[PDB]
Design a protein around this ligand. Sequence first.
Ligand SMILES: CN(C)c1ccc2c(-c3cc(C(=O)NCCOCCOCCCCCCCl)ccc3C(=O)O)c3ccc(=[N+](C)C)cc-3oc2c1
Ligand SMILES: [Cl-]
Length: 293
Amino acid sequence: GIGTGFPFDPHYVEVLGERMHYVDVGPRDGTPVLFLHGNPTSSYVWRNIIPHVAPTHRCIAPDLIGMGKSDKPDLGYFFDDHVRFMDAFIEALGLEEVVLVIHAWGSALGFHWAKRNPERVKGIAFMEFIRPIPTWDEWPEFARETFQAFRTTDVGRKLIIDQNVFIEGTLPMGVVRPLTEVEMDHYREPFLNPVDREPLWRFPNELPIAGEPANIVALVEEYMDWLHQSPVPKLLFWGTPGVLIPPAEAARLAKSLPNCKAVDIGPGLNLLQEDNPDLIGSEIARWLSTLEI
Ligand SMILES: CN(C)c1ccc2c(-c3cc(C(=O)NCCOCCOCCCCCCCl)ccc3C(=O)O)c3ccc(=[N+](C)C)cc-3oc2c1
Ligand SMILES: [Cl-]
């Protein structure tokens, strides 16, 4: 079955006075592949995809500040905080040019870095990614009341911080196949203490929905503007029925974005890595071999 373990040797690097954990495997020469997780996951989400890429390319998978095995400073965990820590992480590792593999909130981080540093990005593989949601009618109806609730300091904090709903409920609702107890426990591990759940609550409060927050909407519009014009090689994974990227939309996006190939993963919602890791990892490895890296 789909693997549940996390065998990777831990690595830590000091970034802005705090430690960030990261997976680092594969050959030391060549162009590295940087994997960026989102909410409420960690590098664990890449555990079954990296084994297809690591034979031929270095794979680096950080845990975002406040998540995974990374330290937990008392921040707001705004998107800007993740930007500062990820920018510093990339420079601390001395990375020059990279290929990005990104998902969901990791996709906003990755696209925003790539737009600012296009000479250092040799390709982007992405899935169930963040674009502006113009009105609440474009948010998936089955998750609309909950995300509206999450975006409050009363009910949203009760749900996400006190009751851990993002881990116990939203995470499984983003995977078609059933998650095992061992997998759930890996996802729960960084957040056993409620107070550490701050990033899980700030993230949905940052989503660019109905114009709000305006600073995030502007930033995401900007990287989308770039992505529709840039010749950067693109690999878009999508699933059925999907969540943010449904099949008919994925096909339209791939034909509109330059130098984009789209790959059907089969059944999927948001966390496509949990529904078909072997296809995602084997397609990434094949696509890397086509790049000038
Ligand atoms: C302990 N306690 C107080 C709760 C409360 C609620 C649940 C829910 C649940 C959750 C939602 C819920 O999250 N909607 C949102 C779904 O969004 C999925 C789509 O992806 C969004 C991606 C966004 C991407 C952004 C970056 Cl691109 C709604 C209502 C309830 C409910 O049952 O009231 C559970 C639901 C499932 C579940 N299992 C399958 C084991 C367990 C649950 O255990 C709860 C415990
Ligand atoms: Cl979120």
